């Protein structure tokens, strides 16, 4: 379980790390990467191609919630769904702001949503233009099903945002997943400022005789 | 009146349906039209003619959609759950639950279908007297196409049953949060302490959305 495992794919990043648990779609992905990486390489890319599948180290096994948003960062991406070192980017600030009114923690530095036990965030498609947001899905279409189709065979509650960006994909995606669409962290007139998702994945965890998520774990001070 | 009406080639010869389902009606005239033959030949609960009587609840003031598999396989009314005389066990053991949610102690009945913001549904419209799922294979289509619409609008859809439910919702084409609950008249008494009745009003409160009075369904 520790040691992570590797196969070889023909272009950049040219090997692939994973955790066992994604063993299942590890095959597929090489050959379905094989087929688009040479188009998709030709642009400058948020993250670099050496960090797009570096979340597949993360186990899924023990997780029983996903936050999922369309793809990265249009800049800075780091390999990490929603990762801000600096916390400079608006989708991490706002939800920064909805974990702070409900868990209490008024100071803090910054949040992350991939140190929180029982969570994993996922960008859904895996790449990005440099500056150009939602511009590789051409590419990631059929790979980006093959992996959220994995995802959800372990966790409990998927949690997308972005009710234009998720609706078709979260309707289409057969599981037994319990499925949230919410609005998008930049949602005209402050939609998501009142959006309290992350209080309804607890409420539908506990129903379902399952541990609620400490959305506090995701602070940095 | 915000009423529509369609024919079809067999009894129940036409229906009347409120705008909000217009968008479907098209295609279910083109579905029943195929199947009517195999559910009139059988003595059917409901009748025909009550088949489709949900049809006339407007769609865009619900917010809950509390699904049954199919029918009573006796004396089905055309409105899900509904027993005239208080005496199926799916709709005394839901009473027996709100019940205890509500603490309304004294009844003689109740009935999903006087509650504001709830819309009752059987995932099926009929079935052979006697036999639950015993037209599921002629209602297939038409049971797809109407769920679908119906979570369109509703933004809580509670199923009852794990084994009726787990494929039919794990495949729904939406993107509805969907709760799976235990079926009240199982032998073995899960349903009564189930909490999915419970967690309703708290997922709509957290959603933004009025509660359901849920002591509205209680007759007197
Ligand atoms: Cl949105
Ligand atoms: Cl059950
Ligand atoms: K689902």
Not at 33 to 38: L, P
Not at 50 to 66: A, E, M
Not at 123 to 132: A, D, F, I, R, V
Request: aromatic share 12%; hydrophobic share 35%; glycine share 4%.
């Amino acid at each position: 379980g520790s040691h992570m495992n590797s196969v070889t794919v023909s272009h950049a990043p040219y090997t692939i790390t994973y955790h066992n648990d994604w063993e299942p779609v590890m095959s597929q992905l090489v050959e379905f990467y094989n087929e688009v990486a040479s188009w998709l390489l030709r642009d400058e890319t948020s993250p670099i191609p050496d960090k797009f599948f570096i979340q597949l180290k993360q186990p899924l096994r023990n997780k029983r919630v996903c936050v999922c948003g369309i793809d990265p960062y249009p800049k800075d991406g780091t390999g990490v769904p929603f990762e801000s070192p600096n916390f400079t980017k608006k989708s991490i600030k706002e939800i920064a702001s909805s974990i702070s009114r409900l868990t209490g923690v008024i100071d803090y530095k910054g949040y992350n949503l991939n140190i929180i036990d029982g969570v994993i965030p996922w960008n859904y498609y895996l790449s990005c233009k440099l500056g150009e947001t939602k511009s590789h899905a051409i590419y990631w279409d059929k790979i980006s099903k093959l992996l959220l189709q994995h995802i959800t065979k372990h966790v409990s509650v998927l949690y997308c945002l972005g009710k234009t960006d998720f609706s078709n994909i979260a309707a289409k995606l057969e599981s037994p997943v319990t499925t949230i669409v919410g609005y998008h962290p930049a949602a005209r007139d402050r939609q998501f400022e009142k959006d309290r998702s992350f209080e309804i994945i607890n409420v539908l965890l506990e129903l379902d005789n399952k541990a609620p998520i400490n959305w506090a774990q995701g602070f940095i001070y």
